[PDB]
């Protein structure tokens, strides 16, 4: 259920008024760590020498309550960008007064405005404060969906609100916080509360907060329409909005007073309980995948590296693609040999990669389920697998499974194969090097002889996710180049982001191959948004067997299908897409006899550096 | 509470303070009324006070026994002075705005007021009903200061951190019309009706800059840089030809004349100084608050 | 209590094998991952193409009970330091299988035996296996207390057991971790799994063990001696050591079969059981101190960083330090003003830090105990603490103090100090920088004024922990000196590791200073073992007044005072002693007018290079 | 005095052509490593079998003379940016080829175009070559002041040369070097070797290249303009350009056969030298600053 919090300006007694907002039913309280009116003079005297207490003490909580329920917000008087030079400097003094009582407290987090449109020195204050020791705070910027100016009564005789649509205008509040995150150098401390006003804008500009840092969404009770009975509700669409934030898992607070003074606070708690509790509840895919949201990993590489007994364990349990193998093979009996020919004609059948054989289990399920006569091989390169399948080849299966411990590429056969069966795909089909190993082993294919699956094809698609750019960031490690984090894909359950264009296909192959395996693919992305570029995530489709096929692509992605996540292909610097401009990215598939790898460049609207040239980051061992 | 706020003297000169505590263990405020001026502020030698639940931005008297304030818990409550003048109780505590309200102005009748809050709004009260009639978004930042026309219910000055005054008049289906200088200087933080033209008053910015406006002819006929910091109040004197006292965050008082000229200063305050009343009784006499908890009376030449 | 395991070579059913040792009462089990007696050959046909399987399945348990119930075990025939190229070879390739193996099955950690002298082969195949992907695997290396070689039966005729002392030589078992885990460069996933046999040798050859990395102590039940009843117990001695090795807090393997055959083999455990049930129950520092231990800190430096509120809050619990601080102001009262002269004599008394207040307090305690009247000035710098002091100064206190918002070396007092009371010592004395802040607060001390405290000293020991080394050494970061992590000091609760000399005194200072703050010591240590010197411990005692004292010399240590741990000053590269030989450490106290920091070498029986030369390393704000 | 060079297509004997240009008074050789008209298979029998050799001996010049004397010339052939895959192929495993044996050489520097918008995957190829280990040898980017599309006679009927001013579009020919240099990472090894044709553009299109990393300025033969006598000259707006390239001290290139046939080639190079040494010599400030150029320097803390 919902992580929510109270906004008060007002604080008499914090003992009471935090025991009050708890049994209202709130998890923390944001409040003033100095009264909010409390102005304060650092320069000229005699208000220089104001007699102290300057705020109420550290003694009236516990450091668990300061540690946990409390967030700090910035007294609302300190205007670091004001335009006297003396506001400036009393501000800049008071903020960091302010910053460094929230540090000594301890505070979870602690809240500052996103008011106009210069806040460089507000931004300048902060950053100096964030390089005053590796201190873990988040700091929360208040940031409203629709600034006040564009939002208010159109009751100025001689200053109207425009009747036309801006639609960079309306998005204004957005460069706001671009602005302000871009000058403290993208800090994994500073997050977004976003603020909701009582009438929402155009989609685009509430799209445009997608792959943002969302902490908190702030909702003042004024934008609660009241029902029948006088229970506080949102619109539809608010609730459309409210629905989307959950998804990113925000903590949800509200901020003014009771409009609804018939009802106890909780009215407005209970709401967004019942909403959260009232949320569709998928999925097949998506509780499977409930804990890899925005997690960057490794791509693994089952060539080069020897896979982990548990990794097998984990992906022998895909039923949907096992279900897809087993009816490949099923359809593919019967096209090849007759009815009359059934008990004549056994079918020489090799697993090419059988690890735990789940796909020799799947070529048994399909020539009984098809009633033909298969003799398996089960060809695995790693030794640790091979003693599970010989295991297994001993006490189940019997001399109808050869298991051939040996890689494919170097595997001299008795006979040649009817059809050979293959599972070496990844999230960019291609990466984990399916065209290579295939290529070494086609040569003990008949020359009628398919292979399962037949085709695979990567596809590309823009997104924009400042979250997952400032994960690749984070990954710099000593004793490597410094940017090498970004030169490299990482397989993510992509979340918080924002795809810019539909996915368009990059490299396909087929199997046999009867004909390099090198490859360059220049895409031109069509973007209908503002938004800013940070890398392009990857998908696949296969053929296993004629209308037989598997999919991460989103548009085809087949139903509860867990077995891969999408690939990330970062950048090292973001792009800047206007509206209307094409992202036109360029990717090569390159190889000597030792590695295979990926570069890739954005060479529209602007030109990106060439991304991991000569394989410098990152290769796929052969 | 050790930070004075409001300083009001009633028609037969008894004194009115708001008073909050802005640091301490507990933020609450509190109303008193000195019926003798020069025992002030102890609170040993008053005549009636009383303790609000959050602390008082602004105060102001409706009429002779009723007190309307703008509280930090984002009410507007109206205290009512007893039939003996000796205990001061709650006739109606709102919480209409959603954030501190910072400024309150009666209007000409004295039966509506019309407050200002941080949370941008502006809302037009009655007093006899205690609703709101008309709530009026039509800035884009905190509303600093909202003046009553002295002599029309439907007119009233405002002015806020979006750097707007706006002229305000209910009768018109727009109310509001923005007035101010030639280009937009610094941000307005006080205003002052001129008590016999009912169609200029003074703007205090927060340059410490006081300037003279004719709505009239929409142009600045002249400023001065009277304080070295923000005017925080400007109050006009009773007299015929009337004073004009500035307050300021530089904690200083200035009086000045016509052409906003200085005639009077004082360095007697050691924090800001935050409200001034003349005395009605004697009109030499001008008595200043501040959140260094004096209470100044100043002789003017 | 204890965690602890069964050692078995001989395990025919693996699940009947694991549900009998859970059921004994074990936590986990050492087992072989291939038939111990099951040779193979990797070169010479035809037992090259021995048909598999090749071992038993990872089917047979769940991966949860590899990754927490088993422990591998190297294959006995496995010898790559064979005299023989063809078993070396063979060996090589084995060892890469098991290890490989174990690796495949995410076995929390796996045995390897140090039997022989020459294990250089053994540590290089390890040392290939460990730089194979990044993999979080424990490697504990069997090593006996005594060499089988020197506990043999004096039964061969021929060739008798020497009935002479060789002091070196009964440390052989040593030397073999030493020379291992030196080849292996200090890999956090190699720890030594002692292995304890019938006749302890020595203490100096148990001493030895001080400061390694022991995650595993072995016990064979033929060293358990029987009692009336029939159960097994330990000797008086062999008690000794499984309390030391309940500290360190090592897991317990039961080895052999069972030789108390009218008893269950929990009888054996139950004894463990027992004795670990049956250990002193310390501590008031102790117990306050579980967690802390051989967990390296950053030194506070509370003059140039605000301390935050929690900081302050746990350092006001430490009554024995406060009662001490009472008890010398208390007894300097009475001193100074005469009984007569009580009434009309107050003291003017300046506690200089004063922080949320508990030696403001003290101070009132002592006056009013004293019967003596005393004006106060709490001077502090953290503005976030003054807000504390004034708050209580208003609420509490009142006008006898005067809460003082200043640098005590800036405040221009109004009357000069009959006593200066500070609380600026570190965990080595001067590393908070208490000379300097007293020097600048000393002019406004009266010409017959005490300071409490008048002195203090730093107390250095040489020690060895190879376990500590480890620790700094992992403390390397990107954008520094590669070996910046060694040129500075480290708060720490000493554990693991072994005290080589008496602690001596370093640097003293006196207060007030009638008479620079720079020092330059030579020390001379006596060491009486074998041993690797890996750094310097330091301590710290203070005369706060006349005999009151405090100290965290463990010797004098004040009891039960959790208020300061010890520093530890590493070294670059561990240095050998000798036993007889002298560790000569060489300490300079070093500043200009912004910083203080210390430099440090080694120079007998080696030279160390000049630790932290001009502060580049860690400097002290000023 | 000016540093300069012969840009040729054509030599016969590299010994004869390389005498005879340092006997015209040149510094250096601008010459391709292979005959440009010389295309090579890599892929497809049976042209992918060619016997050899594929070029002329590195015998033919001692180590010192390939060092100093000789700049490569990327073969006019090779399009790593065609629009036909095969084209593509044989122009990346081509241009590996070319650049491989310019660093067997150990040239100076080598050659290459900029003539169309998109030369994406030619600055891929390039970046692969100049990452197979840390190798000191300089690329000259040959990029025009002036697009030759953009220049072209007004003579095509059903397609005339704009007569309006596209103040972006003069500048296109700035996109194409910025657009290569950053794909290839702002590589130390990646200089402009600037052509300068007939008719300058307006003065923005020019003001363009200061800051970039100018190596070589290429002057053709026929942006000459004839005086009186027979000598080559140049504008007065030619001049002003030379003046400015002297400064940065930039290699002059020059490229075309002699339309001043009644004049040894050094008339060329002779008018360069008079023009050098006709510049205005400064200067108190200059003359003391001689040597500090773009020299990045700490600053100094007296205190
Ligand atoms: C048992 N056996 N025995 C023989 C063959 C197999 C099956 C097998 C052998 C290898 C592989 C497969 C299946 C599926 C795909 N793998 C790789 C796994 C990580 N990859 C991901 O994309 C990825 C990351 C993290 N989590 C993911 N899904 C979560 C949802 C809960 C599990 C997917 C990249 C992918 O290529 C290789
Ligand atoms: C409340 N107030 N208000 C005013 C003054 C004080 C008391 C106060 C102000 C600062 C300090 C003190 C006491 C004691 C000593 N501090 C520093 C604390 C960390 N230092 C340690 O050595 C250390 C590390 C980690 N854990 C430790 N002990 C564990 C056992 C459970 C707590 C000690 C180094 C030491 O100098 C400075
Ligand atoms: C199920 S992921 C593919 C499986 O095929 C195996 N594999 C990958 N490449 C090859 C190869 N070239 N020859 C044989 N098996 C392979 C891997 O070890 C893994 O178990
Ligand atoms: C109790 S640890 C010492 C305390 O004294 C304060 N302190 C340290 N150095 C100084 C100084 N030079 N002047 C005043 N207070 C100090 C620190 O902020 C801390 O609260
Ligand atoms: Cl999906
Ligand atoms: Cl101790
Ligand atoms: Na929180
Ligand atoms: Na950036
Ligand atoms: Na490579
Ligand atoms: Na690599
Ligand atoms: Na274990
Ligand atoms: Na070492
Ligand atoms: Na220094
Ligand atoms: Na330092
Ligand atoms: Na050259």
């Known amino acids: 259920r919902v992580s929510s919090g109270r906004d008060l300006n007002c604080v008499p007694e914090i003992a009471d008024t935090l025991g009050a907002v708890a049994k209202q039913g709130f998890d923390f309280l944001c409040m003033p760590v100095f009264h909010p009116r409390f102005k304060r003079e650092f320069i000229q005297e005699p208000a220089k020498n104001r007699p102290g207490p300057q705020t109420r003490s550290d003694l009236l909580l516990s450091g668990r309550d300061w540690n946990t329920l409390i967030v700090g917000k910035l007294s609302p008087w300190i205007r670091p960008d004001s335009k006297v030079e003396k506001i400036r400097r009393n501000s800049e003094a008071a903020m960091l007064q302010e910053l460094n009582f929230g540090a000594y407290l301890g505070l979870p987090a602690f809240l500052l405005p996103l008011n106009q449109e210069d806040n460089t020195n507000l931004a300048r204050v902060l950053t100096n404060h964030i390089h005053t020791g590796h201190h873990s705070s988040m700091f929360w910027m208040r940031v409203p969906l629709v600034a006040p100016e564009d939002l208010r009564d159109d009751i100025i005789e001689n200053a109207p609100t425009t009747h036309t649509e801006e639609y960079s205008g309306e998005e204004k509040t957005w460069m706001w916080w671009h602005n302000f995150r871009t000058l403290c150098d993208y800090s994994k401390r500073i997050a977004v509360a976003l603020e909701i006003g009582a009438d929402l804008p155009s989609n685009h500009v509430i799209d445009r907060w997608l792959g943002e840092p969302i902490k908190a969404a702030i909702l003042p009770t004024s934008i609660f329409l009241t029902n029948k009975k006088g229970f506080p509700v949102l619109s539809k669409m608010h609730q459309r909005l409210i629905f989307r934030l959950l998804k990113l898992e925000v903590q949800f607070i509200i901020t003014g007073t009771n409009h609804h003074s018939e009802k106890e606070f909780c009215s407005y708690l209970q709401y967004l309980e019942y909403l959260s509790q009232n949320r569709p509840p998928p999925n097949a895919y998506e509780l499977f995948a409930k804990g890899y949201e925005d997690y960057l990993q490794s791509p693994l590489q089952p060539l080069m590296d020897n896979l982990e007994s548990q990794t097998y364990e984990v992906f022998e349990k895909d039923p949907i693609k096992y279900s897809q193998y087993q009816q490949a093979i099923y359809k593919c009996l019967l096209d090849r040999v007759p009815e009359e020919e059934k008990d004549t004609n056994v079918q020489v059948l090799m697993v090419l990669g059988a690890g735990r054989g789940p796909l020799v289990n799947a070529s048994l399920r399909a020539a009984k389920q098809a009633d033909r006569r298969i003799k398996l091989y089960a060809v695995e390169k790693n030794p640790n697998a091979v003693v599970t399948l010989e295991n297994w080849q001993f006490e189940e299966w019997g001399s109808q499974v050869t298991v051939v411990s040996s890689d494919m590429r170097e595997w001299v056969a008795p006979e040649k194969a009817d059809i050979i069966v293959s599972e070496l795909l990844g999230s960019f089909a291609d990466n984990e090097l399916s065209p290579e190993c295939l290529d070494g082993a086609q040569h003990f294919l008949k020359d009628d002889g398919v292979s399962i699956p037949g085709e695979y094809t990567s ?101 509860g299908m867990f077995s891969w996540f999408p690939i990330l292909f970062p950048i090292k610097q973001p792009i800047t897409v206007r509206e209307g401009q094409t992202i036109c990215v360029r990717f090569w598939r390159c190889s000597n006899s030792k590695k295979v790898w990926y570069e890739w460049a954005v060479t529209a609207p602007v030109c990106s550096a060439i991304h991991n040239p000569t394989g410098r980051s990152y290769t796929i061992g052969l | 509470e050790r930070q004075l706020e409001a300083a009001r003297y009633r028609s037969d000169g008894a004194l009115l303070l708001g008073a909050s505590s802005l640091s301490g263990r507990c933020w609450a405020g509190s109303l008193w009324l000195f019926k003798d001026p020069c025992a002030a502020p102890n609170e040993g030698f008053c005549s009636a006070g009383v303790q609000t639940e959050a602390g008082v931005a602004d105060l102001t008297w409706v009429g002779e026994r009723g007190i309307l304030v703008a509280s930090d818990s984002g009410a507007v409550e109206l205290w009512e002075l007893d039939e003996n003048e000796t205990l001061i109780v709650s006739k ?174 004082s360095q007697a305050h050691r924090d800001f100084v935050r409200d001034a009343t003349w005395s009605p009784l004697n009109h030499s006499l001008l008595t200043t608050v501040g959140w260094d908890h004096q209470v100044v009376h100043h002789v003017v030449p």
């Open chain 1, 459 to 559: 596809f590309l698609a823009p997104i924009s996710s400042s979250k997952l750019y400032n994960e690749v960031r984070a990954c710099r490690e000593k004793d490597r180049d410094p940017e090498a984090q970004f030169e490299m894909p990482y397989v993510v359950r992509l979340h918080n982001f924002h795809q810019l264009s539909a996915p368009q296909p990059c490299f396909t192959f087929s199997h046999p191959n009867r004909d390099d395996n090198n490859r360059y693919c220049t895409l031109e992305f069509p973007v209908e948004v503002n938004t800013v570029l940070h890398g392009f995530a990857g998908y696949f489709e296969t053929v296993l067997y004629q209308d037989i096929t598997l999919s991460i692509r989103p548009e085809t992605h087949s139903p």
């Open chain 2, 92 to 265: 109606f505590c709102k919480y209409e705005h959603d954030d501190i309200v910072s400024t309150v102005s009666v209007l000409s009748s004295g039966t509506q007021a019309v407050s200002g809050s941080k949370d941008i709004c502006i809302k037009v009260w009655d007093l006899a009903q205690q609703v709101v009639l008309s709530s009026y978004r039509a800035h884009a930042a905190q509303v600093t200061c909202v003046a009553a026309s002295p002599h029309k219910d439907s007119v009233f000055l405002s002015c806020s951190e979006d750097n707007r005054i706006l002229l305000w008049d209910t009768r018109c289906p727009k109310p509001a019309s923005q007035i101010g200088c030639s280009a937009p200087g610094y941000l307005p933080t006080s205003l002052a009706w001129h008590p016999q033209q009912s169609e200029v008053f003074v703007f205090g910015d927060e340059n410490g800059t006081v300037s003279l406006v004719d709505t009239k002819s929409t142009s600045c006929v002249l400023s001065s840089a009277v304080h070295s910091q923000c005017v925080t109040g400007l109050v006009f004197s009773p007299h015929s030809v009337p004073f004009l006292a500035s307050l300021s965050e530089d904690c200083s008082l200035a009086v000045l004349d016509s052409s906003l000229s200085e005639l009077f200063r």
